[PDB]
């Protein structure tokens, strides 16, 4: 098929050529001799044309291309925004789970391009390409869902899932043999930090400093609140507040943007910008496992 061929070509173009070999070592769809027939020192057009030749010599399909896309996503895992779904209310099996999920998504409207790829730490990665009742599913607007066996949490990349969100949720909860499924308001791009947060897996004596008690108290409070461990890499926060003025409630809306949050916030108190004890709205981001807030009077 030409569609799968151009899909694989686009995925390869997305892959940096410096690691394409690793991709093959992770893809393993093509024989190692075919890999040896291609040198990676030559031009990008030449290498992609040779890869097209290699995949056309074999039988190119959708499952192998989807697996390649999944493994590319694994190696990057930095280009999408992730949200977290919680299931609530004990026997598991991979095969029957896959069968049930596939059956539900086929029953969704008529068809959908679904691909599975088991990963270490029970990380089943699922690539889903949506399609309507009268069109083949589109491979240009995919979505990714990460499931952990026998766990109350799942991860989803929401690029176009706002079209049909309840469908994916109900399919996931029926496949997970769980009744209640909810979406907590927690959204971020560093997927590994989300993993850590959801599971809680994280001299010149002539100078006479004055107010040194204030400095030692503020540094101690900051250390006790944050800790010596490297804080999870979180990148976006937003609070929606509506509280009485006390100085008709004022409605406030703040967004914190930072390439490395929880560290500038860690340095605010030592820099003297904020008080020694920070407000609970900022000291419970890893504690409450909450990223978006709403405050009323």
């Amino acid at each position: 098929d030409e569609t799968v061929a151009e899909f694989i070509k686009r995925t390869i173009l997305k892959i940096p050529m410096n690691e394409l070999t690793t991709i093959l070592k992770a893809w393993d769809f093509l024989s190692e001799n075919q890999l040896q027939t291609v040198n990676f020192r030559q031009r990008k057009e030449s290498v992609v044309q040779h890869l097209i030749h290699l995949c056309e010599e074999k039988r190119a399909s959708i499952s192998d291309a989807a697996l390649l896309d999944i493994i590319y996503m694994q190696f990057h895992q930095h280009q999408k925004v992730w949200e977290v779904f919680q299931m609530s209310k004990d026997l598991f099996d991979m095969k029957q789970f896959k069968n049930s999920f596939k059956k539900i998504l086929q029953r969704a409207l008529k068809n959908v391009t679904v691909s599975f790829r088991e990963t270490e730490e029970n990380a089943v990665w699922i690539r889903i390409a949506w399609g309507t009742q009268y069109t083949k599913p589109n491979q240009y607007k995919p979505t990714y869902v990460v499931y952990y066996s026998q766990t109350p949490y799942a991860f989803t990349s929401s690029s176009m899932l706002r079209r049909n969100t309840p469908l994916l949720g109900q399919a996931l909860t029926i496949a997970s043999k769980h009744h209640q499924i909810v979406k907590m308001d927690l959204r971020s791009r560093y997927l590994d930090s989300l993993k850590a947060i959801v599971f809680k897996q994280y001299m010149d004596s002539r100078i006479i400093h004055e107010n040194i008690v204030e400095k030692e108290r503020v540094q101690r409070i900051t250390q006790e609140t944050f800790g010596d461990y490297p804080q999870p890499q979180l990148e976006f926060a937003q609070y929606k507040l509506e509280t009485k003025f006390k100085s008709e409630p004022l409605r406030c809306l703040i967004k914190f943007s930072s390439p490395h949050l929880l560290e500038a916030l860690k340095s605010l108190a030592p820099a003297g910008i904020a008080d020694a004890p920070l407000s609970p709205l900022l000291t419970c981001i890893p504690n409450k496992r909450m990223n978006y807030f709403k405050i009323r009077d």
């Binding site: 308001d185 709205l281 909450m290 807030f293 709403k294 405050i295 009323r296 009077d297």
Partner: peptide, 6 residues
């Protein structure tokens, strides 16, 4: 109050 109902 942190409104947890949204």
């Amino acid at each position: 109050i942190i409104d947890e109902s949204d």
